[PDB]
């Protein structure tokens, strides 16, 4: 990918770049999933051994406070601001807020809201004054790449994201193990209740949670499962990674062309009865200028 920016890239030292990041050593892991209930179109399989070079990855998704500093330093205008609207979950749109008649096919719970963007996540009249440490949302893939490049970083590949999110466990269902609420404790922010009609908030949150909520995984990463979907570098496909080759098994970058970029990790909206996509092997995509109230990102870096 060859992005274009209207800000210069500042000089930063290795020590500055690595703050808040964990060093993932080079090695192999078992990527992918073989859950019999996975949707075939998602291409969770095959399970395969992948070798990665050492890399750094953020412990936390990028926060509102951090994105605000980027915007203050650069004047960056996000895709949602340029388009003038973004997607908000229906239950979070205050009555009377102007909304578009737009229809996401098959997903009527998504509302296109004029004026919804990272600083006003539910549209005009909303703010992030009480959410400085929540993940920034309404950021597109382009916005994420712009932030990451300004920060001296990049987006993780899907394989880097998944190795870090798995946290040293071999083929577990979730970042922490195989049980969703071990010891009766919520470990991530997803939906409870009856999707899309009623979220009970059993895990404490019916929207985003702070980026440091819940226990970390074994590598010290927080909210890799749930909270917000996270952009990765790769173009999406369901089958590029079914090939067994060095390109798909050593530092794999995904297909060279595509239409949508990969997102990992699930969000506060995911639920077993609908998508079941908060398992660590799960994956979906979105087009790169798209934005939504449940999608953000974390950065990676070469040491």
């Amino acid at each position: 990918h060859m992005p274009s920016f209207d800000f210069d890239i500042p000089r930063r030292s290795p020590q500055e770049i690595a703050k808040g990041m964990v060093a993932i050593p080079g090695g192999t892991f078992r990527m992918g999933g073989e859950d019999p209930d996975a949707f075939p179109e998602d291409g969770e399989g095959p399970v395969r051994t992948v070798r990665l070079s050492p890399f750094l990855i953020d412990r936390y998704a990028v926060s509102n406070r951090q994105f605000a500093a980027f915007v203050k330093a650069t004047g960056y205008v996000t895709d949602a601001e340029r388009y003038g609207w973004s997607f908000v979950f229906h239950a979070h749109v205050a009555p009377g807020t102007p909304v578009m008649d737009a229809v996401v096919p098959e997903a009527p719970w998504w509302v296109a809201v004029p004026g919804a963007y990272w600083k006003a996540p539910e549209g005009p009249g909303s703010s992030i004054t009480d959410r400085p440490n929540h993940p920034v949302v309404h950021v597109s893939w382009n916005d994420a790449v712009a932030y990451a490049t300004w920060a001296g970083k990049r987006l993780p590949t899907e394989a880097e994201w998944e190795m870090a999110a798995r946290g040293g466990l071999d083929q577990a269902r979730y970042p922490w193990g195989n049980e969703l609420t071990p010891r009766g404790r919520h470990r991530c922010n997803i939906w409870q209740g009856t999707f899309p009609v009623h979220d009970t908030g059993e895990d404490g949150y019916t929207g985003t949670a702070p980026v440091n909520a819940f226990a970390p995984n074994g590598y010290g990463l927080y909210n890799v499962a749930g909270n917000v979907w996270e952009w990765c570098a790769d173009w999406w496909s369901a089958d590029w990674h079914a090939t067994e080759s060095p390109a798909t098994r050593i530092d794999p970058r995904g297909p060279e062309t595509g239409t949508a970029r990969v997102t990992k990790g699930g969000s506060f909206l995911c639920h077993e009865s609908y998508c079941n996509r908060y398992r660590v092997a799960a994956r979906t995509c979105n087009t790169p200028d798209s934005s939504a109230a449940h999608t953000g990102f974390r950065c990676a870096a070469d040491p």
Binding site: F39, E41, D42, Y83, F87, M100, A102, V103, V104, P105, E106, A107, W110, A112, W229, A260, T263, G266, S267, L269, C270, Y274, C275, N276, R277, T284, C285, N286, T287, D289, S290, A292, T295
Partner: peptide
């Protein structure tokens, strides 16, 4: 009925 949707795209709402 079809694959569940978690990523709502700007392109998806264009239809005439």
């Amino acid at each position: 009925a079809t694959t569940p949707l978690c990523g709502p795209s700007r392109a998806s709402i264009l239809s005439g």
